[PDB]
Design a protein around this ligand. Structure first.
Ligand SMILES: CCCCCCCCCCCCCCCCCC(=O)OC[C@H](COP(=O)([O-])OCC(O)COP(=O)([O-])OC[C@@H](COC(=O)CCCCCCCCCCCCCCCCC)OC(=O)CCCCCCCCCCCCCCCCC)OC(=O)CCCCCCCCCCCCCCCCC
Ligand SMILES: CCCCCCCCCCCCCCCCCC(=O)OC[C@H](COP(=O)([O-])OCC(O)COP(=O)([O-])OC[C@@H](COC(=O)CCCCCCCCCCCCCCCCC)OC(=O)CCCCCCCCCCCCCCCCC)OC(=O)CCCCCCCCCCCCCCCCC
Ligand SMILES: COC1=C(OC)C(=O)C(C/C=C(/C)CC/C=C(/C)CC/C=C(/C)CC/C=C(\C)CC/C=C(\C)CC/C=C(\C)CC/C=C(/C)CC/C=C(/C)CC/C=C(/C)CCC=C(C)C)=C(C)C1=O
Ligand SMILES: CCCCCCCCCCCCCCCCC[C@@H](O)O[C@H](CO[C@H](O)CCCCCCCCCCCCCCC)COP(=O)(O)OCC[N+](C)(C)C
Ligand SMILES: CCCCCCCCCCCCCCCCC[C@@H](O)O[C@H](CO[C@H](O)CCCCCCCCCCCCCCC)COP(=O)(O)OCC[N+](C)(C)C
Ligand SMILES: CCCCCCCC/C=C\CCCCCCCC(=O)OC[C@H](COP(=O)(O)OCCN)OC(=O)CCCCCCC/C=C\CCCCCCCC
Ligand SMILES: CCCCCCCC/C=C\CCCCCCCC(=O)OC[C@H](COP(=O)(O)OCCN)OC(=O)CCCCCCC/C=C\CCCCCCCC
Ligand SMILES: CCCCCCCC/C=C\CCCCCCCC(=O)OC[C@H](COP(=O)(O)OCCN)OC(=O)CCCCCCC/C=C\CCCCCCCC
Ligand SMILES: CCCCCCCC/C=C\CCCCCCCC(=O)O[C@H](COC(=O)CCCCCCC/C=C/CCCCCCCC)COP(=O)(O)OCCN
Ligand SMILES: CCCCCCCC/C=C\CCCCCCCC(=O)O[C@H](COC(=O)CCCCCCC/C=C/CCCCCCCC)COP(=O)(O)OCCN
Lengths: 115, 83, 347, 98, 70, 105, 113, 175, 318
């Protein structure tokens, strides 16, 4: 209930700053002024055209390595168990396969960006 | 013996980060099985009383169960204070 | 694809299926399906081309939808009973959702649309895998929860599968789509007897897998995927076309061939449960499968189609690779009817 | 049942419907698949917390793991489709018929 | 200077002193002067709820000693 | 279909997680531990067909603990009758139900 | 390079030793306060029992008054076939009370920050 | 009854689902799914699931960032669609909104079996348990049990993650 | 009285950001043999006020090709999250006491990136899009390593509660047990706050103004405020995590002073670093995080899991 009040206060302050920024100063908007910036000149194509991603394979791999973090975050609590040999074996096993998947993609040129 | 020597030489010269990483990983894997304190950690975890110790109904045939906490029977944590 | 990677992926497909088959927990069964699909997508695209990409994409979409539905059914079942064990579903709505999810995984009508397209889009080896090994897991799950399932929905989907397999197979000249529609009809037969006797389901599945393995291996040996390309095999390998002719008649279900045993066993079991009408429809409809098998046998073995001049060069070369189990598969596909009482060992 | 449970099941039904009815982009369907997983995670978590099944607190994490694998799988296929056609449209993949 | 950088650093340090000191003083002011109670687990929350009930003024911070057991 | 490798080898690959009454960490119990214990012990070894008829009482109690459908119905009935009798002024709620109780430890 | 690496490893070993001692002491302290909680638990259990039973009795009397006109209503009738004690649902205990107590009872601990 | 916070949160959850299921531009679909993930975090937090809520929020933030990159890379069109730039998207959005409205009305003013079963409402607080014990979080204990009880689960999930890396490398190879 | 505390936390933080702008200008000035602002107010004290007033009385412009709704939402999200990230910090007491404070910090930080992505996309300008895609790449580069480093360091603490970090370090700073993780963590916080040499998203030399080039006046000032607030917040977190200050329950002002001095030192170190180095190419940053930091981080996670068990040094509060 305190965190909800905090979030509400912060969003309200930011929104009021935007409101002031838009309603206090004088506004003189014309087409030349509101046009897209490309350093002196008119853009050739649209900025909504497909923009190639050369690290597309590291982006997919990030999705799988980010879930390794969800499996490793309970580790401070897992350390409190009685069968520490099973916990340590399992935790070590998990990080070893994470290192092996990194070694696989590295040696197969999966970390190099497309050319 | 001399193949791996020059191999680790070239690795330390070209990829010291990977050398240190494999050293630290291998140590983390093998050292816990040679330690006399891993059992101490298991025992420390077992000595932590998270829930209530439910008493047993005395039937006159329990020579090794205390009838009051300060009685001498039962487990002792003396080893822990001196640790 | 590196051979070691291909072996690892085939082993992951098989281990996902075995996880589905050995598990007692619904979550582990779901994990088995997930692992199977994950390893199976690359096997479809092993020979890269736009058609293989499209087939793998349609396959992934269908199977992932089925997976979400399956998980939702598990969660509703847990909500109405704090149970994770796969026995008999507690909630009727969860059972409907589960049945439809497994029917989508199997490709039963009306969820049959994906099977012909994906089968046509991939190679003959991947088609062999897709039409034999990919059936074990959902069928085993269905066998476990058989008492719980509603007969009306299951039998509706089974009769639809038989009808649609026959009708769709009538129109094909590509051999992979013929095999796919054949598979759809066979699945209909397997699921029609499921609420009565799971041993008959297992027997039907074993005989179908034997005949399908034999057919796919014969199609690989004579590297043909169309009807007209298979019309040449007589002028290079006549024994292959004769064996294919007999295997085709066994698929048709004609006696004294093995293919007739599953149909015969299923009809008999159904009559015991006072169900004369469903079986009469099923057999009269399997007549369509027999028709297009007979058409393929006409074009391939019983008559001789014209050939080409370059076949003379092929006359001089033996096959580089030989299939070890092809001979055994043909014999088990044709000559096993006298051993029918051995089905008791399946229960 | 509780109002909250009804809302989560409705979310699953809506995402399932979204997946079923395709438009032009494949990425939108992939998003619908993710949405279904999100609703399954929430529903299972609510049921598990409510009944105090302690050991079942780990299954939503497994659910997320597999969901990530499925998401990764979906994006790979989209990369290959887009490389073939220069577009991720569903209509392009009509080469194979029934 | 270089020591002319120090006035801005001092203003920034004075601005950063405020949140922690204000939180400490507000905690002490609204918790009977004794360091707002921490309830990370439900046992501590149960202790706080029992304290609120026995105070008689519906405040957890008010503490009843041995003068309350006749 | 179901090859029981666990039972043949005595492994416990996933049976530790199938039910709510089975060995939780720190002995934390399930909310419906006793009802489930009772339904499991009532139906054990008699098979699925007999268990659904002969253990329906235990299972109905278990489901009531799980979802609490009858309890919410009874509470709704009581509160509707309270609302109705209060609107007409026939019934006056006690002080200990309006916020003026003498709280006890 | 040797000197830098040696200073680093020595720093780490000193830190490890210090943290080992400090965390052992912390674990002893945690055991001690857990045992205080254990010594206190019976009194809390006794008064929790009395509090729950008193709330149930008050609800029962108010329900005997409220549900007298409805024709076929057994006051205090259980919804279970079993006759053993069932832990009361939160709604049953606070069903006939003010929204502030219901809020404090359901979300009081979760929201306390 | 009390503040019906979780009801508002679950309604916003459904609204975000309608937002991204209407199948508009992916930039707005991912926005809708982020909103849904955040309010689902809140829903789970209100029941005692702090770790699970925060975890699903974190995971979906990472996933939607990858999806934003892929949308600019392969999902772009000269005029990306919003919920009001298309009759088809707007119609799906409105139909989902008032379908949720009809479900919620029919459920809270009388007691109907929609598809599975029925419900009267009362707010979520009624089904709680009033349990009083512990120096720990039971959620944290059950999740930590993955390393002592759930050895088999750890094995199968680790294998699937390694295989997933290998699989994406195989799929995106080309040739 | 709780709103008094919220305002007490927020008003000061914005003032500290305002004067961090001046301190950075003067520190970079003196490292460059010049002075920086010394005219507007004694020693440039009034320069931040003039800058703020100049920005909020200038005309804000909405681009013709831009998506107006996301264009306006992005800076609101940025500033509101920058303010929110402060509430669980124990100084020595937190405004909000959380069980999982570290994990809340991670989630809010991970959500902060969307404002940069959305603002760049909403702008519908080429340079803004290039900046936004650089932000995608930057998150992919440092996100996995940053989380595993926190996990490894936190194992000694025993929980994810931020106030426990004070007790963990009653006798020694946690940097004497994990200085390698501390180094990698410092560089990851440089990358996570888009700061030189890791400030690829702004790309001032390369892309002129990156994601915020279109932005003018008040909306622009909001992005600036958010970034500098994040710079102070990260350093404060770094101070609490690796250089725990002794805390006296009966005199918390001493802890407050110690903590503020340490976070000021770390912020000035950021400014120094910016004055000293050349900018990393964006592909290179990914290589740096994935081929050097991630292997060492995996090995050190293994080591920090094994070490408390080997030595019977495991911490309390499961
Ligand atoms: C009962 C039900 C009835 C029967 C079931 C249905 C039958 C359908 C089976 C179809 C199989 C498909 C197939 O293999 O190829 C099709 C194949 C056609 O292909 P082809 O035209 O001949 O040429 C293909 C070439 O291989 C072109 O490929 P290539 O050039 O790359 O050649 C590579 C080749 C050559 O291979 C090599 O190079 C060997 C090198 C070794 C590499 C080392 C890798 C090891 C590391 C990976 C470890 C993974 C472990 C997983 C961990 C999981 C953790 C949970 O390897 C292979 O061809 C595939 C290898 C198959 C592996 C089989 C091993 C069994 C795995 C069991 C897993 C279960 C584990 C326990 C589960 C516990 C539960 C969780 O079909 C046939 O040849 C005849 C059909 C035979 C079917 C079986 C007969 C019926 C039953 C008897
Ligand atoms: C039930 C209904 C659901 C409620 C919808 C929420 C309110 C949004 C409706 C107003 C926005 C549209 C106004 C407009 O078009 O230009 C205004 C007006 C017209 O300009 P114009 O050049 O003449 O025409 C432009 C074109 O018409 C078109 O130009 P355009 O490209 O800008 O149009 C696109 C716009 C048009 O909108 C529509 O197409 C129809 C509106 C339906 C959108 C709902 C879809 C579901 C999305 C997720 C659910 C969000 C919660 C909804 C539930 C409400 C309860 C909280 O769609 C949006 O961008 C809506 C974005 C709202 C999402 C805000 C959430 C931020 C995420 C923060 C992180 C998440 C943390 C975890 C939680 O220009 C202005 O006045 C300046 C901009 C005003 C924008 C101020 C802030 C935007 C609204 C705040 C969102 C509320 C958050 C709380
Ligand atoms: C190599 O050249 C460069 C520099 O070197 C000379 C720079 O410094 C530099 C950094 C930019 C500077 C010019 C600093 C600009 C100063 C800010 C934009 C002003 C921000 C101050 C306000 C917006 C904060 C709010 C004002 C209030 C007083 C705070 C309190 C808030 C109330 C609610 C109370 C850049 C980009 C640069 O390129
Ligand atoms: C730190 C965050 C919080 C700060 C605390 C202060 C909160 C500030 C909130 C933000 C608003 C302040 C902006 C400052 C200028 C006012 C902008 C606007 O509200 O004024 C005019 C509003 O006027 C409207 O245009 C119409 C006037 C009357 C409208 C009728 C509304 C009903 C009132 C009935 C009249 C009877 C008396 C009412 C009082 C009881 C807009 O005119 P316009 O020229 O476009 O905009 C440019 C403004 N310029 C000229 C200063 C540059
Ligand atoms: C017959 C064929 C065998 C070889 C091929 C098998 C292929 C599958 C892979 C391995 C099979 C799984 C066997 C392990 C099952 C786990 C359960 C069992 O082992 O007990 C555990 C014993 O733990 C041991 O550490 C076993 C785990 C070691 C396995 C690590 C590597 C093995 C997998 C290798 C293949 C996996 C894929 C490839 C990756 C390299 C836990 O026992 P414990 O904790 O006392 O008591 C638990 C009860 N409590 C909680 C109440 C206290
Ligand atoms: C409800 C569904 C019930 C299913 C009943 C199926 C009956 C089995 C018979 C299948 C006949 C299929 C015929 C067909 O599909 O096409 C007709 C065929 C198409 O020629 P194609 O070879 O395919 O192409 C050549 C050009 N490229 O045209 C013909 O000339 C057919 C010639 C042979 C027809 C034989 C029909 C014999 C029927 C005998 C009577 C009993 C039939 C079964 C029904 C009995 C009545 C209840
Ligand atoms: C936005 C992302 C929401 C994440 C909020 C996380 C806040 C948090 O972690 O506080 C936890 C705190 C206490 O947890 P413990 O650590 O266990 O300590 C107390 C127990 N003794 O939990 C709470 O207080 C729960 C309060 C309600 C949750 C807030 C839900 C916020 C959801 C955001 C929705 C936004 C508004 C709706 C529309 C959104 C878009 C238009
Ligand atoms: C004082 C005067 C009040 C005027 C109010 C008008 C509001 C409005 O939308 O008008 C548009 C106005 C100015 O444009 P013009 O009309 O062209 O010029 C005005 C000068 N003649 O535009 C704005 O400033 C809109 C500012 C936003 C208002 C605040 C609401 C925004 C909601 C954002 C929600 C997203 C939050 C996400 C972060 C939270 C997550 C934890
Ligand atoms: C048993 C320990 C396991 C657990 C610890 C490890 C956990 C995490 C560490 C492993 C992460 C994955 C490592 C992936 C390896 C990639 C190899 C590679 O291909 O990179 C080489 C670089 O590395 C190599 O040279 C290949 C391997 C050479 C040996 C590397 C280390 C092997 C082990 C060395 C130490 C042995 C054990 C420690 C003993 C210490 C002495 C007492 C090429 O570099 P590029 O980036 O492509 O350059 C591009 C510009 N030209
Ligand atoms: C007894 C058991 C002990 C176990 C082992 C523990 C000891 C470990 C010993 C080694 C520790 C080394 C940790 C360092 C981690 C990264 C080191 C590294 O190699 O990174 C560099 C790159 O890292 C950098 O140089 C940083 C770039 C950005 C610099 C930013 C400013 C510089 C730093 C300022 C001071 C840092 C202060 C950090 C701590 C602050 C206090 C909290 C590698 O990149 P390249 O040289 O290009 O080679 C790659 C191809 N082979």
């Amino acid at each position: 209930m305190n965190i909800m009040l905090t979030l509400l206060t912060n969003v309200t302050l930011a929104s009021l700053l935007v409101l002031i920024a838009f309603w206090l100063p004088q506004l003189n908007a014309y087409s030349e002024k509101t046009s897209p910036y490309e350093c002196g000149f008119d853009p050739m194509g649209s900025a909504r055209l497909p923009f190639s991603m050369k690290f597309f394979l590291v982006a997919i791999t990030f999705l799988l390595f980010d879930l390794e973090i969800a499996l490793l975050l309970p580790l401070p609590w897992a350390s409190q168990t009685n069968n520490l040999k099973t916990m340590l074996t399992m935790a070590l096993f998990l990080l070893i396969l994470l290192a092996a998947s990194l070694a696989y993609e590295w040696t197969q040129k999966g970390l190099e960006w497309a050319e | 013996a001399g193949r791996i020597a020059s191999f680790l030489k070239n690795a330390w010269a070209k990829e010291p980060v990977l050398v240190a990483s494999f050293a630290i990983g291998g140590l983390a894997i093998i050292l816990p099985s040679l330690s006399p304190y891993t059992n101490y950690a298991i025992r420390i975890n077992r000595a932590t009383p998270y829930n209530y110790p439910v008493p047993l109904r005395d039937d006159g045939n329990m020579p090794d169960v205390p009838s009051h906490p300060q009685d001498p029977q039962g487990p002792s944590l003396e080893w822990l204070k001196n640790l | 694809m590196n051979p070691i990677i291909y072996t690892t992926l085939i082993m992951t497909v098989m281990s996902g299926t075995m996880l589905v088959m050995i598990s007692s927990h619904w979550l582990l069964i779901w994990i088995g399906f997930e692992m199977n699909l994950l390893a199976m997508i690359p096997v479809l695209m092993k020979n890269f081309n736009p058609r293989a990409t499209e087939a793998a994409t349609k396959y992934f979409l269908t199977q992932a939808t089925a997976s979400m539905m399956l998980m939702m059914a598990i969660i509703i079942n847990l909500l109405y009973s704090g149970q994770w064990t796969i026995t008999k579903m507690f909630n009727p709505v969860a059972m409907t959702m589960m049945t439809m999810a497994l029917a989508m995984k199997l490709g039963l009508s009306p969820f049959h649309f994906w099977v012909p397209e994906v089968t046509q889009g991939i190679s003959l080896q991947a088609g062999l895998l897709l039409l034999t090994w990919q059936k074990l897991a959902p069928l085993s799950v269905l066998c476990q929860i058989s008492q719980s399932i509603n007969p009306n929905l299951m039998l509706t989907m089974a009769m639809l599968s038989i009808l649609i397999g026959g009708w769709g197979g009538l129109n094909q000249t590509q051999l992979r789509k013929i095999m796919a529609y054949s598979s759809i009809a066979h699945m209909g037969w397997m699921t029609a007897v499921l609420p009565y006797n799971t041993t008959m389901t297992i027997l039907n599945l074993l005989i179908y897998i034997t005949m399908t393995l034999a057919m796919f291996m014969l199609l690989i040996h004579s590297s043909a995927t169309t009807t007209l390309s298979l019309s040449h095999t007589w002028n290079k390998m006549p024994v292959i076309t004769s064996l294919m002719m007999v295997t085709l008649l066994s698929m048709g279900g004609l006696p004294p061939l093995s293919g007739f045993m599953p149909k015969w066993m299923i009809i008999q079991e159904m009559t015991k449960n006072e169900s004369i009408i469903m079986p009469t429809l099923m057999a009269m409809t399997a007549l369509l499968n027999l028709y297009f098998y007979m058409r393929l046998a006409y074009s391939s073995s019983l008559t001789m189609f014209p050939s080409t001049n370059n076949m003379k060069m092929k006359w001089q070369f033996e096959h580089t690779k030989q299939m070890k189990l092809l001979p055994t598969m043909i014999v088990l596909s044709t000559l096993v009817l006298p051993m029918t009482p051995a089905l008791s060992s399946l229960n | 049942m509780p109002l909250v449970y009804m809302n989560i099941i409705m979310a699953f039904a809506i995402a399932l419907a979204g997946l079923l009815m395709y438009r032009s982009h494949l990425m939108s369907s992939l998003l619908c698949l993710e949405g279904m997983m999100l609703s399954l995670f929430i529903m299972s978590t609510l049921i598990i917390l409510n009944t105090h099944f302690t050991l079942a607190n780990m299954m939503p994490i497994i659910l997320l793991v597999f969901a990530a694998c499925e998401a990764a799988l979906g994006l790979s296929l989209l990369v290959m489709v887009s490389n073939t056609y220069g577009t991720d449209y569903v209509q392009n993949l009509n080469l194979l018929q029934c | 200077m270089w020591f002319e950088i120090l006035p801005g650093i001092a203003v920034m340090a004075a601005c950063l002193f405020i949140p922690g000191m204000a939180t400490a003083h507000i905690h002490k002011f609204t918790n009977g002067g004794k360091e707002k109670r921490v309830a990370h687990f439900s046992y501590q929350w149960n202790l706080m709820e029992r304290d609120r009930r026995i105070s008689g003024v519906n405040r957890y911070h008010v503490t009843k000693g041995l003068e309350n057991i006749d | 279909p179901f090859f029981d490798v666990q039972k043949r080898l005595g492994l416990d690959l996933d049976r530790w997680m199938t039910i709510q009454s089975a060995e939780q960490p720190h002995k934390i119990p399930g909310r419906c531990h006793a009802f489930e214990k009772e339904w499991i012990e009532c139906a054990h070894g008699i098979g699925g067909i007999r268990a659904e008829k002969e253990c329906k009482i235990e299972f109905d109690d278990f489901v009531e603990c799980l979802l609490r459908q009858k309890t919410m119905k009874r509470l709704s009935a009581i509160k509707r009758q309270r609302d109705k009798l209060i609107k007409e002024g026939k019934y006056t709620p006690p002080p200990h139900h309006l916020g003026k109780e003498d709280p006890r430890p | 390079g040797y000197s830098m690496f040696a200073v680093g490893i020595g720093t780490l070993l000193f830190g490890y030793w210090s943290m080992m001692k400090w965390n052992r002491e912390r674990r002893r302290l945690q055991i001690e306060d857990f045992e205080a909680r254990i010594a206190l638990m019976p009194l809390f259990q006794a008064e929790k029992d009395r509090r729950v039973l008193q709330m149930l009795r008050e609800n029962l009397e108010e329900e005997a008054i409220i549900m007298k006109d409805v024709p076929d209503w057994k006051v205090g009738e259980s919804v279970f076939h079993t006759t053993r004690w069932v832990t009361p649902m939160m709604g049953e205990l606070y069903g006939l009370r003010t929204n502030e107590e219901i809020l404090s009872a359901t979300y009081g601990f979760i929201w306390y920050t | 009854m009390t503040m019906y916070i979780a009801f508002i949160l679950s309604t916003i959850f459904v609204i975000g689902f309608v937002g991204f299921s209407s199948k508009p531009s992916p930039i707005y679909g991912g926005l809708g799914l982020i909103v849904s993930g955040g309010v689902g975090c809140g829903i789970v937090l209100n029941f005692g699931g702090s770790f699970l809520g925060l975890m699903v929020f974190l995971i979906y933030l990472g996933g939607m960032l990858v999806v934003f990159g892929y949308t600019t890379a392969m999902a772009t069109e000269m005029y990306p669609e919003v919920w009001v730039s298309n009759k088809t998207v707007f119609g799906a959005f409105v139909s989902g909104l008032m379908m949720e409205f009809c479900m919620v009305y029919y459920a809270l003013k009388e007691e109907e079996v929609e598809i599975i079963f029925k419900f009267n409402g009362l707010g979520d607080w009624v089904i709680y348990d009033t349990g009083d014990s512990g120096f720990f979080s039971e959620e944290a204990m059950g999740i930590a049990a993955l390393y002592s009880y759930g050895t088999w689960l750890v094995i199968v999930t680790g294998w699937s993650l390694l295989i997933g890396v290998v699989v994406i490398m195989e799929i995106t190879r080309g040739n | 009285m709780f709103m008094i505390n919220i305002l007490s936390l927020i008003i000061p933080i914005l003032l500290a950001v305002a004067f961090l702008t001046l301190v950075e200008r003067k520190v970079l000035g003196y490292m460059q043999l010049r002075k920086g602002p010394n005219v507007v107010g004694p020693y440039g004290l009034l320069q931040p006020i003039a800058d703020a007033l100049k920005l909020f009385t200038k005309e804000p412009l909405r681009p013709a090709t831009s998506s107006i709704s996301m264009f306006i939402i992005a800076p609101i999200l940025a500033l509101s999250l920058a303010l929110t990230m402060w509430v669980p910090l124990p100084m020595p007491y937190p405004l909000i006491n959380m069980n999982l404070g570290v994990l809340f910090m991670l989630a809010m930080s991970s959500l902060a990136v969307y404002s940069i992505l959305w603002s760049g996309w909403a702008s519908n300008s080429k340079y803004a899009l290039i900046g936004a895609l650089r932000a995608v790449a930057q998150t992919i580069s440092y996100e996995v390593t940053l989380a595993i480093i926190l996990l490894s360091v936190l194992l000694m603490n025993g929980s994810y509660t931020l106030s426990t970090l004070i007790t963990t370090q009653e006798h020694i700073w946690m940097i004497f047990t994990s200085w390698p993780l501390a180094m990698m963590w410092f560089i990851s916080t440089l990358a996570e706050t888009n700061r030189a040499p890791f400030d690829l998203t702004e790309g001032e030399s390369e892309l002129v103004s990156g994601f915020n080039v279109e932005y003018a006046a008040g909306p622009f000032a909001m992005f600036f405020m958010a970034e500098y607030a994040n710079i102070i917040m990260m350093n404060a977190f770094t101070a609490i995590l690796f250089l725990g200050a002794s805390h006296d329950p009966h005199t918390p002002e001493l802890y407050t002073i110690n903590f503020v001095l340490k976070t000021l030192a770390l912020t000035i170190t950021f400014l120094w670093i910016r004055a000293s180095y050349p900018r990393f190419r964006y592909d290179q940053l990914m290589h740096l995080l994935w081929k050097s930091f991630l292997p060492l981080t995996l090995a050190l996670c293994m080591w920090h899991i094994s070490l408390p068990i080997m030595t019977a040094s495991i911490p309390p509060q499961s």
